[PDB]
Design a protein around this motif. Structure first.
Motif, PDB file in Angstrom:
ATOM      1  N   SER A  63       0.846  -1.179   0.000  1.00  0.00           N
ATOM      2  CA  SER A  63       0.000   0.000   0.000  1.00  0.00           C
ATOM      3  C   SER A  63       0.884   1.232   0.000  1.00  0.00           C
ATOM      4  N   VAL A  64       0.530   2.212  -0.818  1.00  0.00           N
ATOM      5  CA  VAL A  64       1.254   3.471  -0.891  1.00  0.00           C
ATOM      6  C   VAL A  64       0.407   4.527  -0.200  1.00  0.00           C
ATOM      7  N   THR A  65       0.885   5.029   0.925  1.00  0.00           N
ATOM      8  CA  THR A  65       0.171   6.073   1.641  1.00  0.00           C
ATOM      9  C   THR A  65       0.903   7.395   1.488  1.00  0.00           C
ATOM     10  N   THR A  66       0.264   8.462   1.943  1.00  0.00           N
ATOM     11  CA  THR A  66       0.848   9.789   1.851  1.00  0.00           C
ATOM     12  C   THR A  66       0.773  10.477   3.200  1.00  0.00           C
ATOM     13  N   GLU A  67       1.717  11.382   3.429  1.00  0.00           N
ATOM     14  CA  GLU A  67       1.614  12.288   4.562  1.00  0.00           C
ATOM     15  C   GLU A  67       2.184  13.636   4.159  1.00  0.00           C
TER      16      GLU A  67
ATOM     17  N   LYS C  89      12.620  12.590   9.124  1.00  0.00           N
ATOM     18  CA  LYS C  89      12.028  11.634   8.191  1.00  0.00           C
ATOM     19  C   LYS C  89      12.768  11.639   6.863  1.00  0.00           C
ATOM     20  N   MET C  90      13.158  12.824   6.397  1.00  0.00           N
ATOM     21  CA  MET C  90      13.961  12.943   5.188  1.00  0.00           C
ATOM     22  C   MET C  90      15.244  12.146   5.314  1.00  0.00           C
ATOM     23  N   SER C  91      15.903  12.255   6.461  1.00  0.00           N
ATOM     24  CA  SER C  91      17.225  11.676   6.622  1.00  0.00           C
ATOM     25  C   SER C  91      17.180  10.165   6.773  1.00  0.00           C
ATOM     26  N   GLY C 105       4.944   5.155   7.953  1.00  0.00           N
ATOM     27  CA  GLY C 105       3.905   4.322   7.391  1.00  0.00           C
ATOM     28  C   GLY C 105       3.399   3.266   8.355  1.00  0.00           C
ATOM     29  N   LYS C 106       2.190   2.792   8.073  1.00  0.00           N
ATOM     30  CA  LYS C 106       1.556   1.736   8.845  1.00  0.00           C
ATOM     31  C   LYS C 106       1.962   0.396   8.256  1.00  0.00           C
ATOM     32  N   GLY C 107       2.641  -0.411   9.051  1.00  0.00           N
ATOM     33  CA  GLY C 107       3.185  -1.668   8.595  1.00  0.00           C
ATOM     34  C   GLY C 107       4.690  -1.595   8.462  1.00  0.00           C
ATOM     35  N   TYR C 108       5.251  -2.679   7.947  1.00  0.00           N
ATOM     36  CA  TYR C 108       6.692  -2.754   7.776  1.00  0.00           C
ATOM     37  C   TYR C 108       7.108  -1.872   6.608  1.00  0.00           C
ATOM     38  N   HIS C 109       8.063  -0.983   6.857  1.00  0.00           N
ATOM     39  CA  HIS C 109       8.435   0.049   5.902  1.00  0.00           C
ATOM     40  C   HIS C 109       9.266  -0.519   4.760  1.00  0.00           C
ATOM     41  N   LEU C 110       9.071   0.041   3.567  1.00  0.00           N
ATOM     42  CA  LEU C 110       9.946  -0.253   2.438  1.00  0.00           C
ATOM     43  C   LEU C 110      10.696   0.970   1.941  1.00  0.00           C
ATOM     44  N   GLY C 120       5.770  23.169   2.027  1.00  0.00           N
ATOM     45  CA  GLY C 120       5.988  21.948   2.769  1.00  0.00           C
ATOM     46  C   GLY C 120       6.377  20.811   1.857  1.00  0.00           C
ATOM     47  N   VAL C 121       6.361  19.618   2.429  1.00  0.00           N
ATOM     48  CA  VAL C 121       6.794  18.422   1.733  1.00  0.00           C
ATOM     49  C   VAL C 121       5.714  17.360   1.856  1.00  0.00           C
ATOM     50  N   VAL C 122       5.675  16.473   0.868  1.00  0.00           N
ATOM     51  CA  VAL C 122       4.720  15.378   0.820  1.00  0.00           C
ATOM     52  C   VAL C 122       5.508  14.091   0.678  1.00  0.00           C
ATOM     53  N   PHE C 123       5.307  13.170   1.605  1.00  0.00           N
ATOM     54  CA  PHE C 123       5.992  11.891   1.589  1.00  0.00           C
ATOM     55  C   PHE C 123       5.044  10.816   1.098  1.00  0.00           C
ATOM     56  N   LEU C 124       5.464  10.093   0.069  1.00  0.00           N
ATOM     57  CA  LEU C 124       4.776   8.890  -0.377  1.00  0.00           C
ATOM     58  C   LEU C 124       5.495   7.709   0.251  1.00  0.00           C
ATOM     59  N   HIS C 125       4.845   7.057   1.201  1.00  0.00           N
ATOM     60  CA  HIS C 125       5.434   5.950   1.934  1.00  0.00           C
ATOM     61  C   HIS C 125       4.972   4.643   1.317  1.00  0.00           C
ATOM     62  N   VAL C 126       5.928   3.802   0.947  1.00  0.00           N
ATOM     63  CA  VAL C 126       5.651   2.470   0.436  1.00  0.00           C
ATOM     64  C   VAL C 126       5.956   1.479   1.547  1.00  0.00           C
TER      65      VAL C 126
END
Ligand SMILES: *[C@@H]1O[C@H](CO)[C@@H](O[C@@H]2O[C@H](CO)[C@@H](O)[C@H](O)[C@H]2NC(C)=O)[C@H](O)[C@H]1NC(C)=O
Ligand SMILES: *[C@@H]1O[C@H](CO)[C@@H](O[C@@H]2O[C@H](CO)[C@@H](O)[C@H](O)[C@H]2NC(C)=O)[C@H](O)[C@H]1NC(C)=O
Ligand SMILES: *[C@@H]1O[C@H](CO)[C@@H](O[C@@H]2O[C@H](CO)[C@@H](O)[C@H](O)[C@H]2NC(C)=O)[C@H](O)[C@H]1NC(C)=O
Ligand SMILES: *[C@@H]1O[C@H](CO)[C@@H](O[C@@H]2O[C@H](CO)[C@@H](O)[C@H](O)[C@H]2NC(C)=O)[C@H](O)[C@H]1NC(C)=O
Ligand SMILES: *[C@@H]1O[C@H](CO)[C@@H](O[C@@H]2O[C@H](CO)[C@@H](O)[C@H](O)[C@H]2NC(C)=O)[C@H](O)[C@H]1NC(C)=O
Ligand SMILES: *[C@@H]1O[C@H](CO)[C@@H](O[C@@H]2O[C@H](CO)[C@@H](O)[C@H](O)[C@H]2NC(C)=O)[C@H](O)[C@H]1NC(C)=O
Ligand SMILES: *[C@@H]1O[C@H](CO)[C@@H](O)[C@H](O)[C@H]1NC(C)=O
Ligand SMILES: *[C@@H]1O[C@H](CO)[C@@H](O)[C@H](O)[C@H]1NC(C)=O
Lengths: 84, 49, 197, 269
Positions: A63-67, C89-91, C105-110, C120-126
């Motif tokens: 799943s790809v989420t955003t913040e 978070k960037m680092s 992110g929710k779950g194990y991070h990739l 500001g900044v927007v993080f796309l967490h996989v």
């Protein structure tokens, strides 16, 4: 009449929903004739615990989420003689 | 003494030279009437948001 | 399609705009003076008296300005804290994979991807999320020839007849051999020892 | 003002200070519910422990909710609650979350972390016996799981003795919760001094609006009222600023608490 005061124009019910407009003291409302009720913490389930049972996942998903995080604001300067 | 509130019976007792009592921030809590000489306590009228 | 997903930045911009707007609007207030315009109170009045009114206006405006500055300072401190977190978070999530739970992110991070945004900044967490569970049957240790065997890495499961060793986050069965087991003492102390080969 | 037409009229032309003050107070009030929600509300569902309790020799009866009590608060929570200890235009609003639902969230967390482990923090809760979650948790500090299964009874007894000693220390020793008491005292004294400021002349002939209004005329009372208004406004502004600073501090602490519970409860930091 509730703990936080009283409501006029709303009708009480005995159900439980994850409400959207918090009223206070646990009471909260929804539209559905406006109604107010007791919020539900969530759908309650019991894990079938024992001392000899586990639950191993057999498939996965990605799943790809955003913040969003602010990092700065606009830089402003103000005089004194010009303003006052 | 000008005020606005609701008057009710006070169970306390004043000393003979005492006239009226206050507790905090000049809140005149109890007053003796000048004619019949009994102490009634004053509470503010109901308000809210 | 879905709007209102960017509430934080919009809120920040609106807060700044409102603060500036009310600071500007404070000019029209009277503060107990006779008027809110300097020129008229100067013209209609004389020297030794209008000074008081001008002083009233001056002190009111000065108080308003100080209040605005203090609000700016508080907001700046808050944004600094947020930006410090953003830099962290960037680092440690963009430039490497993170281990601390539920930080990226929710779950194990990739991984993560950064994108700019007006302030500001927007993080796309996989991330990674499992599903499709089962039960099987467990026993903490397997002793052969009377001596225990613990798994080098994994956990013991069974489907009723055959016992298997697997890893913790994906169903994958393997037969048991010394290659993934190590011995420790004899099976008389552990609670849950079961026979096998 | 306190119910004065003249005071309201005079305050009207002082700009929009009151709107800003109310907005700031409302923002910091919402922030408290925000903090509580972002801390406790970590779990999608609510779990409940099975009635049959056998955790491989450990004992949690003093921390699990007790059905006998109407509040369903566990024993340690009651000890804590017992340990920890008018109207002039200021009001106190109740928290959104009451005590019972807070207790239910705590119980759900505490009963998920017993049987499911850490897996319920990422996806769906997966059952696993406790005596094996301890083996997993030793395997995460450089100690092989070899140790635990020969020392199950000793470890269980040590854990029970330690938890009992904690219970006794909390019950007997006083002032063991200094931080919360300090926070409460700070708030109380701030409100108290704000109330007490109402009895200061500030240069006016008296500290009561009604009396100076009733004894003077509506030309000269202007100055006295103005002095009172500006002094009280200054005091209120100071109180608001102090409140803002303290609220920012509390938000920092709550962020730390949320991080601690996400990292240490839902996994081994
Ligand atoms: C694990 O879940 C994924 C997600 O649905 C499954 O992938 C789908 O499988 C079906 C059956 O072949 C396909 O028709 C779909 O196109 C697949 N999804 C995608 C996005 O390609 C996968 O089959 C599941 N694996 C197991 C072993 O059940
Ligand atoms: C494993 O088997 C258990 C039963 O041994 C299943 O447990 C179910 O749990 C739900 C939740 O309370 C109950 O409503 C069902 O009645 C239970 N099923 C029964 C008792 O047969 C469980 O679903 C199975 N799978 C997993 C992953 O635990
Ligand atoms: C448990 O899993 C084992 C491992 O596959 C199963 O054993 C095999 O089962 C298939 C299908 O019946 C046979 O063709 C193989 O010869 C079996 N191999 C061995 C080594 O036994 C077993 O059937 C499964 N049992 C259950 C109840 O699911
Ligand atoms: C898991 O718990 C069950 C229930 O407490 C245990 O089953 C009991 O085991 C004892 C010891 O032989 C018997 O005397 C009881 O009759 C059993 N009762 C039931 C309902 O099964 C079981 O031994 C435990 N297993 C482990 C590995 O701890
Ligand atoms: C595992 O097997 C061993 C031997 O095969 C069992 O040890 C003894 O087995 C004999 C033969 O049945 C019994 O008379 C003894 O009572 C057993 N000793 C003990 C201490 O149990 C052993 O019991 C088996 N264990 C399990 C869990 O199946
Ligand atoms: C778990 O701890 C509880 C609380 O200490 C124990 O309950 C007490 O046990 C003692 C000794 O058995 C009794 O004297 C008390 O009367 C019990 N109190 C209550 C309220 O039940 C409980 O026995 C312990 N259980 C285990 C398995 O360790
Ligand atoms: C349900 O709600 C109504 C109105 O809120 C109330 O009068 C009634 O007592 C409640 N309970 C039942 C069982 O109807
Ligand atoms: C006060 O004086 C009036 C007028 O004479 C009289 O009617 C009243 O009874 C007096 N009250 C007392 C308490 O003496």
């Amino acid at each position: 009449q509730t703990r936080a005061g009283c409501l006029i124009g709303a009708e009480h019910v005995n159900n439980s929903y994850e409400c959207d407009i918090p009223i206070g003291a646990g009471i909260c409302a929804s539209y559905q004739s406006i109604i107010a009720y007791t919020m539900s913490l969530g759908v309650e389930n019991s894990v079938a615990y024992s001392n000899n049972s586990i639950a191993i996942p057999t498939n996965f998903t990605i799943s790809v989420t955003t913040e969003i995080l602010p990092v700065s604001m606009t830089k402003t300067s103000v005089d004194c003689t010009m303003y006052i | 003494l000008t005020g606005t509130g609701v008057l009710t019976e006070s169970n306390k007792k004043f000393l003979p030279f005492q006239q009226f009592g206050r507790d905090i921030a000049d809140t005149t809590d109890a007053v003796r009437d000048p004619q019949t000489l009994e102490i009634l306590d004053i509470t503010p009228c109901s308000f809210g948001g | 399609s879905t709007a209102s997903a960017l509430g934080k930045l919009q809120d920040v911009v609106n807060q700044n705009a409102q603060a500036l707007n009310t600071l500007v609007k404070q000019l029209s207030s009277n503060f107990g003076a006779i008027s809110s315009v300097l020129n008229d109170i100067l013209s209609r009045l004389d020297k030794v008296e209008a000074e008081v009114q001008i002083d009233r206006l001056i002190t009111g405006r000065l108080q308003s300005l100080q209040t605005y500055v203090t609000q700016q300072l508080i907001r700046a401190a808050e944004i600094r804290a947020s930006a410090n977190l953003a830099a962290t978070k960037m680092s440690e999530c963009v430039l490497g994979q993170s281990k601390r739970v539920d930080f990226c992110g929710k779950g194990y991070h990739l991984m993560s991807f950064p994108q700019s945004a007006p302030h500001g900044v927007v993080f796309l967490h996989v991330t990674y999320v499992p599903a499709q569970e089962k039960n099987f049957t467990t026993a903490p240790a397997i002793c052969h020839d009377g001596k225990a065997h613990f798994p080098r890495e994994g956990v013991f499961v069974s489907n009723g007849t055959h016992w298997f060793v697997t890893q913790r986050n994906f169903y994958e069965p393997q037969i048991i051999t010394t290659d993934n087991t190590f011995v420790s003492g004899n099976c008389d102390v552990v609670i849950g020892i079961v026979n096998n080969t | 003002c306190g119910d004065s037409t003249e005071c309201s009229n005079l305050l009207l032309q002082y700009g929009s200070f009151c709107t800003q003050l109310n907005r700031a107070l409302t923002g910091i009030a919402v922030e408290q519910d925000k903090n509580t929600q972002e801390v406790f509300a970590q779990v999608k569902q609510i779990y409940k422990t099975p009635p049959i309790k056998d955790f491989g020799g450990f004992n949690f009866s003093q921390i699990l909710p007790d059905p006998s009590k109407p509040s369903k608060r566990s024993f340690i929570e009651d000890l804590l609650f017992n340990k920890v200890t008018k109207f002039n235009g200021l009001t106190v609003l109740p928290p959104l979350l009451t005590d019972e639902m807070i207790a239910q969230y705590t119980s759900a967390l505490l009963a998920g972390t017993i049987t499911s482990g850490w897996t319920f923090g990422a996806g769906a809760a997966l059952q696993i016996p406790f005596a094996m979650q301890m083996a997993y948790r030793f395997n995460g500090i450089g100690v092989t799981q070899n140790v635990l299964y020969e020392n199950q009874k000793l470890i269980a007894n040590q854990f029970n003795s330690a938890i009992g000693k904690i219970q006794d220390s909390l019950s007997s020793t006083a002032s063991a919760l200094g931080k919360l008491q300090d926070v409460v005292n700070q708030n109380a004294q701030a409100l108290n001094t704000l109330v007490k400021q109402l009895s200061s002349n500030f240069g006016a002939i008296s500290s009561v609006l009604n009396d100076i209004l009733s004894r003077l005329d509506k030309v000269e009372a202007e100055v006295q009222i103005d002095r009172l208004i500006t002094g009280r406004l200054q005091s209120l502004q100071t109180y608001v600023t102090q409140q803002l600073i303290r609220a920012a501090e509390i938000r920092a602490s709550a962020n730390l608490a949320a991080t601690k519970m996400s990292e240490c409860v839902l996994g081994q930091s």
